[PDB]
Structures are given as C-alpha cells and as structure tokens.
Amino acid sequence: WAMALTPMEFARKYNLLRKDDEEMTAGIRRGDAKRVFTMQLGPYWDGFERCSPQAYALSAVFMARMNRDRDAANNILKVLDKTFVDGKPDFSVARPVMKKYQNSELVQEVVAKHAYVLTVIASLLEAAREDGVVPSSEFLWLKPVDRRLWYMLNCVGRQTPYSEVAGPFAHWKAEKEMGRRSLVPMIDEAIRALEIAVKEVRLTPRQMEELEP
Amino acid sequence: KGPWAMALTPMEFARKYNLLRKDDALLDNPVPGEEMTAGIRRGDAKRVFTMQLGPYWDGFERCSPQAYALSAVFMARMNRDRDAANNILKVLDKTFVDGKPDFSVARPVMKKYQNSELVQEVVAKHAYVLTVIASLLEAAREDGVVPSSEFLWLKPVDRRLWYMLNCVGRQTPYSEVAGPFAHWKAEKEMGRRSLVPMIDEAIRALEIAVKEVRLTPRQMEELE
C-alpha cells in the first residue's frame, strides 16, 4: 500500500505548517503536533485480550521467541502467512501461545516497563531479537492489516522513525530511558525532530503564500 | 475493494462479468436435481477467460518487472543457486517496507540463467508469460519449498500474477485466473506451447460451480 509520509508530507497532511517570524521555510504548530503525536500513541496496554487481534498475535510470536520456543513462534507466522493468502488471517492460532507465555518472567518484565500497547510490543520485538533475526519480512501481511503497527515494528532497531509513528517511537525510547512505564505522553522528541526536518525543506512561493500565522 | 480484496467466488465472478443467464436446458426439460439455478453465457465467458491469459511470452525483458524478478528467483532455484534466489527475495522485501522494490536486482540473475537448459525447456513448452512463470515455479519447487508467502508483496502490484502463482499445486484455481490456469494445464497435456487459447476447462468449471448455487425466485426472474 502507500509509501510512508515524509516529514513535510506529514506536516502538510495534519495542517502543522506555520508562518515563522532559512528563506522560504515553514515553522511548526507545536501544540497541534503534540496532539497528533499523542494520537499516534494508541491505546494503553491493559491486558493482551484487549489488544487488536494483530497486536495480540504478533505479541504471542515474540513472547514465544523470548521464551526460546521457535516452533510455537513459527507456527503462528506460518498459519498467518497461509491464511493471509486465503483471505482472512486466523489470529486465534495465537491464543494458545499467549496463554502459555503472557505470565512468563521476561514478558512480565516488558509489560511492567511500558504503558502503551505499541511500546509493549516494540520491546517484545526487541527482546525476541536476542534469540534470532525476526524481520518484518516474516510478517509482510501486517502492512495492509494495520499500518501504524507495521511502521512501529519496522522502526525497532532504527535510530530515526517514520513520522507516522514518531509519537509512539519517542515515547517508547522515553520509557526505556526513564526505566519505568509512563502514562503521561513523552513525545517532545517527535516535535523537535519534525521542526528540524521541516526547516530543511524549501517551499515554493505558492506554498509560502498559503501559510497562516 | 482496493488492492487487498479477497478473491471472487465463482458466483461473484459470474455476476461481475454478466455471465449469468436463464438455463433453457432445464426450462425445456426440468430436472428435479437442479431447480432454481442459472446458466452461463459461454461466449461471453470465453472472452473473459481469454482476457485473463495476458501477454504472449516474448523474451523476459518484455515481461512486467515483477514477472521478470520472480522468474529470475525461480530460474535460480531451478539451477540450485538458492543464494541468488534469496538475495532477490531479501531485497524485494526490504524495499517494500517503505518505498518501491528493487526489481533491477533480478537483472544479473536473469542474465545468468535465462538460457540455461532447464529454463529453455520451460520456455519452449509455454506460450504466455503466466504459463511460463507457472511452470518455472513448479520446477523451482523440485529444489525445495518456495511458498507464495515470500512474495506476499506481489498481491498489491499484480493481482492476476499473484493468484496465478498461488494456484500452482492447487487442483482448482480462483475464477479470476481460471483462464491461464486452464491454458497452462492444456499446454502440459498437449506437450507443446499453444498460442490459440485453450480455456474450455475454465468455462466447464464455471458452469458446474454456478449450478451448485440455488437462486431465490426473484433472482431467477432477473436472469436473462
């Protein structure tokens, strides 16, 4: 499906550009950007049963790999790949695995330290990678099912996220740096990165004339 | 709807292409076994199935870039160069995350293997791009498993190619590739390539499929 938005396209898509007051450059609406990034953070973690089916199922894959059970992990990934051909993925294949590993030590440690679904599952993926490679390419089907999740998970191991998940990315890294879960959004790093990225791009005269204060 | 839609069932396919009609074989001589069932417009069905066949094979360089690259992957497998095959699959996968795939990555492998004996045997025996590639996939599966999983990304770029390759090893194809599947089988049965479309099995199968679905009274009356 669609390419990830660049910082400028993202800013334009969410009406984040402002007259600043270097030539032919826009500023950012910080309050507005804060809210957009806060919106990207998604739901609080509050038991895996309340996760979307896709986050449920990939969490289970990663829990399996953390607990060194490649077979259970590959069986989910395998069934989801086939069933995806067919038309609708069978997320229920993940239920047995969740039941078995959701209360394991290494998983409880991740859940303890992260307040949002997206930041839990990012750290489950990071931890699963201490066992083996776990590429996005084992779960190609995710992009059309859930774009935000796909982008979050493809940013695990990266320095700089896609703007469309810059919120949950910044929050995730803030939680790791604080050493605790945070329910208060910690997304300021996403704002500063957007401002920097936007000031690098020149606007045309038409685009400058369309800027409001 | 959109690039990710599920495959049409036979009855949905027949409706989409206006292939249903009143069946005058059971109007003129009703069988208890078949009340309330439509017939198929055989001439319109031939056209539609023939339109799914796609272009003649005429040098891999004339193929779509996705058909090009996948052919190269299967070529490499047929020739037992798993590394060259997997590199293409890695690069295609990486590039699909965010932007647009590196199909050019396939060019060295195509250059290398396209005139190989096992590839020349397949190309000799099939007349259409879809039928060539189906047979390259079937041959590449002599080497090892080559699941359609690995080219997940094809579905959005080329719906037809994706369903075609997912029916390799199936006994019954999706209606939307029933034409080239039928033709590919007819080629293997004849033992030569055929430019004349051999899509009769696609029509028979659609007729049979449609006869299994009871219509409502209203639906029977709307039939022409």
Author numbering:
A (entry chain A): 159 to 179, 189 to 380
B (entry chain B): 156 to 379
The study reports:
The T4BS secretion coupling complex of L. pneumophila comprises the inner membrane AAA+ ATPase DotL (IcmO) and two inner membrane/cytoplasmic components, DotM (IcmP) and DotN (IcmJ). In this study, we determine the crystal structure of the cytoplasmic domain of DotM and observe large patches of basic residues, leading us to hypothesize that DotM might form the recruiting platform for Glu-rich motif-containing effectors. Our results suggest that DotM’s cytoplasmic domain is capable of binding directly another subgroup of Legionella effectors that contain acidic Glu-rich motifs at their C terminus.
Thus, a shorter construct (residues 153–380, referred thereafter as DotM153) was cloned, expressed, and purified. DotM153 crystals however diffracted to 1.8 Å resolution. These crystals contained two molecules in the asymmetric unit. The DotM153 crystal structure is similar to that published by Kwak et al. (PDB entry code 5 × 1U; root mean square deviation (RMSD) in Cα atoms of 0.4 Å) and reveals an all-α-helical fold, comprising 13 α-helices connected by loops, many of them proline-rich. Residues 179–188 in monomer A in the loop connecting helices α1 and α2 were not resolved, indicating flexibility in this region of the protein. The pear-shape structure is formed of a narrower end made by two elongated sequences emanating from both the N- and C-terminal regions of the sequence: α1, α2, and part of the α3 on one side and α13 and α12 on the other. The remaining α-helices (α4 to α11) form a larger compact structure with helices α7, α8, α9, and α10 tightly wrapping around a helical bundle formed by α4, α5, and α6. While the structural homology search and structure-based sequence alignment yielded no clue as to the function of DotM, functional implications could however be derived from a striking feature of the DotM153 structure: its highly charged surface. Indeed, DotM153 contains 33 surface-exposed Lys/Arg and 28 surface-exposed Glu/Asp residues scattered around the entire surface of the protein. Peptides CegC3, Lpg1663, and OSM that contain a Glu-rich motif exhibited high affinity to DotM153 (KD values of 0.19, 0.7, and 0.35 μM, respectively), whereas Lem21 and LegC8 which do not contain C-terminal Glu-rich motifs did not bind.
